[PDB]
Amino acid sequence: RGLGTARLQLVEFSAFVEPPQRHLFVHISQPPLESVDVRQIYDKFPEKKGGLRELYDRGPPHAFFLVKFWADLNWSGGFYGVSSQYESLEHMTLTCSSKVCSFGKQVVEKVETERAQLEDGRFVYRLLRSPMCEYLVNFLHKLRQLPERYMMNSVLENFTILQVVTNRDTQELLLCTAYVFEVSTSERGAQHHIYRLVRD
Secondary structure (H helix, E strand, C coil), X not given: CCCECCCCEEEEEEEEEECCCXXXXXXXXXXXXXXXXXXXXXXXXCCCXXXXXXXHHHCCHHHEEEEEEEECCCCCCCEEEEEEEEEECCCCEEEEEEEEEECCEEEEEEEEEEECEEECCEEEEXXXXXXXXXXXXXXXXXXXXXXXXXXXXXXXXXXXXXXEEEECCCCCEEEEEEEEEEECCCCCCCEEEEEEEECC
16 A cells, blocks of 8 residues: 555655755655545535545545645745656556645645656656745745744644646546645654545
């Protein structure tokens, strides 16, 4: 079990800031996964069209994952970027939609397209150094100034991301990942915990 199906697998995901080498706010580099019932987090995502509940209803359910991040927020200019890499055995073009939610309502949607590239006997899909939406750069700047880690976590309870990767040519849903967030201490460092989303 990783974040992936037989059809597409997440290889690496990071959100970072670079000076004008890198600070990683969160990072995934890729036993069986534990499960989280989607009803547990229904009250953290839009009940609106295209949200988590509507998508999970249409399935397929094994495409759905939850990532809990403990972000490192201890690092004024600079490049804010997000990098993601997927791999598959079949040649596809991917549409990747990233939806930022604050208090349930969607405040950002970012849609990118990536064509397969053959590498080492498989297909890779590289969306590297995508600039972070301005909403998030400003939010990180404000969040960083909070005096106490528990105040950051309070604020972050209301903040979620939903990423939806689809086969662009077929419109088939390949992967749907819900992200929730807390802040880590500088001593522990960034951490994550991937879960299968279930409902049965």
